[PDB]
């Protein structure tokens, strides 16, 4: 398919360079991944400090490079807990210049305290499924298992 | 918003 070949071109040219999760109230980086978590067909793992569950909001800063242009780069992320979808997150970056490196910052706000899930319940049981799109074209689907430490 | 983040 024309569309499959293009998706593959974009992916071959795409990578996540680094990513921070920063406490938006203190400024402190709590977690910094340097692995390319866009890579599909393998389960990635991430260990995050459990005190991230106490933040009122987190700044997620993602640095990525793309050889190909994208008209409307966006993400859909699902949070699966023991295979149940609990949450769905949507983020839009927009136009990506060909051969560019870009930092994308987004604020993820905590739910009310009474709805937050405990670390000991979550750890090892959460999968984040990320679909990377250019508008309606699915470029990659990646999976990351989270451990809260 | 999130119950895990
Ligand atoms: C506070 C947010 C948490 C606990 C999880 C955020 C997502 C990851 C860490 C890993 C997946 C992220 C991408 C593939 C962009």
Residue numbers in the entry:
A (entry chain A): 2 to 150
B (entry chain C): 640 to 644
What does the paper say about this structure?
PDE6δ was shown to bind prenylated peptides or proteins of the Ras subfamily with approximately micromolar affinity and to play a critical role in their cellular distribution. INPP5E belongs to the inositol polyphosphate 5′-phosphatase family that hydrolyzes the 5′-phosphate of phosphatidylinositols and localizes to primary cilia. INPP5E contains a C-terminal CaaX motif where the C-terminal residue Cys644 is farnesylated.
The proteins show a hydrophobic cavity, where the farnesyl moieties of INPP5E and Rheb are inserted (upper). The prenyl groups overlay well and make an identical interaction pattern with the surrounding hydrophobic residues of PDE6δ (lower). However, the side chains of the residues on the −1 and −3 positions upstream of the farnesylated cysteine (the 0 position) in INPP5E and Rheb show different contacts with PDE6δ. On the other hand, the lysine side chain of Rheb at the −3 position is pointing away from the binding pocket of PDE6δ, while the serine side chain of INPP5E at the equivalent position makes a hydrogen bond with the side chain of glutamic acid (Glu88) (lower). Thus, we reasoned that the different contact patterns of INPP5E and Rheb peptides with PDE6δ are responsible for the difference in affinities. Hence, we used a fluorescently labelled C-terminal farnesylated and carboxy-methylated peptide of INPP5E (residues 637–644) and Rheb (residues 175–181) to measure the affinity to PDE6δ by fluorescence polarization. Figure 1b (left) shows that PDE6δ binds to INPP5E peptide with low nanomolar affinity (Kd=3.7 nM±0.2,±indicates s.d., n=9). Analysis of the data with a competition model derived from the law of mass action as described shows that the affinities to PDE6δ can be reversed, with a Kd values of (697±54 nM,±indicates s.d., n=14) for INPP5E(KS) and (12±2.7 nM,±indicates s.d., n=12) for Rheb(SI). Structural analysis revealed that the residues at the −1 and −3 positions relative to the farnesylated cysteine are the determinants for the binding affinity to PDE6δ.
